[PDB]
Amino acid sequence: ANKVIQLQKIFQSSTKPLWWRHPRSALYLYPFYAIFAVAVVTPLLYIPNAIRGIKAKKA
């Protein structure tokens, strides 16, 4: 609803990093770090079974 001047006055007069300057940034950024932290380390846990040759249980 044309908040662009009001958002310019926040994004320019701010100290926080650019991905944190919006008021709603804590709603995006805090779940994403948890989802990212499991998404990058769960294949690394399956790397040793793939080296040993152990397939997962499907039946």
């Binding site: 044309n2 662009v4 650019l18 991905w19 990212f36 998404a39």
Partner: protein, 269 residues
């Protein structure tokens, strides 16, 4: 302006970007995607939850990168004329790279079709394969693409002409026509006789038009974000470069769909 006050600005028109986490985040997401798909393709991981999580993380990290680009371009005023020219040139080199991917796929189709094998029967399309006829639904798919370009052209020129309702409505018509095309391609893929496993014909056909399908679903996404930014007054009458890149993208997907049409549906039947 005085020397004292000119010294409080940049002296050169180029964007010195602040340090950002999304390069290394997208890199680790591509790592997790590669390591997840290479282990679910061979059964070392039970289900597709890791691949789903990796693709979701990849998409959301790209979205946060694009959010920061929107923030730089709109709320900090960092995109000058030279930066605009550079972004347009980078998008043109990008679409040249993708046209070359399609040229490799057309090379694959032509190498299979110019003189076919003996295991298909010196025949094209091969024996038993019920080819998609070019008259029924792909003709409507060419029509709703040549018309989608005509809609986005007046939407663009009405964005320049000061009109707001005539540009938003044209963008909305363009977006809905693109998703009409995507659902018609889904209907063709369901009601198609051959599958992707049905030999080299199904391979090259679904490779070419499925890459076009993926480019069209990303086109629908960027038409949606252009509608959002035009309704919320981000796009202006003289400075709309993401919109311009989307227009270039529509008009190259149009001509490569035409080449896919006349090659995969007319010459190859």
């Amino acid at each position: 302006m005085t020397h004292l006050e000119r010294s409080r600005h940049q002296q050169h028109p180029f964007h010195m970007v602040m340090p950002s986490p999304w390069p290394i985040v997208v890199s680790f997401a591509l790592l997790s995607l590669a390591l997840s798909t290479a282990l679910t393709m061979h059964g070392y991981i039970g289900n597709m939850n890791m691949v789903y999580l990796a693709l979701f993380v990849l998409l959301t990290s790209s979205i946060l990168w694009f959010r920061d680009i929107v923030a730089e371009a709109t709320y900090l005023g960092d995109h000058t004329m030279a930066v605009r020219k550079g972004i347009n040139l980078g998008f043109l080199m990008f679409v040249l790279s993708e046209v070359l991917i399609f040229a490799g796929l057309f090379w694959a189709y032509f190498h299979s079709a110019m003189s076919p094998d003996v295991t298909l029967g010196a025949c094209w399309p091969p024996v038993g394969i019920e080819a998609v006829q070019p008259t029924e639904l792909p003709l409507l798919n060419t029509i709703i693409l040549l018309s989608s370009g005509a809609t986005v052209t007046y939407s663009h020129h009405a964005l320049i002409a000061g009109n707001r309702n005539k540009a938003l409505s044209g963008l909305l018509i363009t977006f809905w026509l693109i998703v009409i095309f995507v659902t018609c391609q889904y209907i063709e893929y369901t009601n198609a006789a051959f599958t992707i496993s049905d030999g080299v014909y199904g391979s090259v056909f679904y490779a070419g038009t499925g890459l076009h399908f993926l480019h069209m679903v990303m086109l629908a996404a960027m038409l949606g974000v252009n509608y959002w930014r035009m309704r919320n007054y981000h796009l202006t009458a003289g400075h709309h470069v993401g919109y311009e890149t989307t227009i270039i993208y529509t008009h190259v997907l149009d001509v490569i769909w035409l080449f896919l049409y006349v090659v995969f549906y007319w010459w190859g039947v």
